[PDB]
């Protein structure tokens, strides 16, 4: 800062801590119901997946 300000570089970061990260298994990531559309595709898929 000021008229003698030293050459400088920027650090960007974040927090969010009471959260835990979520990924909906849903064909678009919205909540459209509790039993998602992909969760129903996997019923009529009748097959095992790893």
């Amino acid at each position: 800062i000021g008229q003698t300000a030293v050459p400088s570089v920027t650090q960007k970061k974040f927090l969010c801590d009471r959260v835990m990260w979520r990924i909906p298994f849903s064909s678009n990531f919205m909540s459209m119901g509790a039993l998602t559309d992909l969760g129903q595709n996997m019923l009529y898929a009748n097959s095992a997946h790893a």
Binding site: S27, N28, M32, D37
Partner: protein
């Protein structure tokens, strides 16, 4: 509800042209909406770096 064809959620457009003056900047974009898309403009924004 959701398409099973290969398509992006977010599209990033680039200035097809830009002009500068001593006090302002002006950029032109071809915002394209494909035949089976619809775009709510409230989802659009100018991402600027400098």
């Amino acid at each position: 509800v959701t398409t099973d064809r290969s398509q992006r959620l977010t599209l990033r457009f680039v200035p097809v042209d830009r002009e500068d003056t001593t006090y302002s900047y002006k950029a032109r974009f071809t915002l394209a909406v494909g035949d089976n898309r619809v775009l709510d403009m409230a989802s659009t924004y100018f991402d600027i770096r400098g």
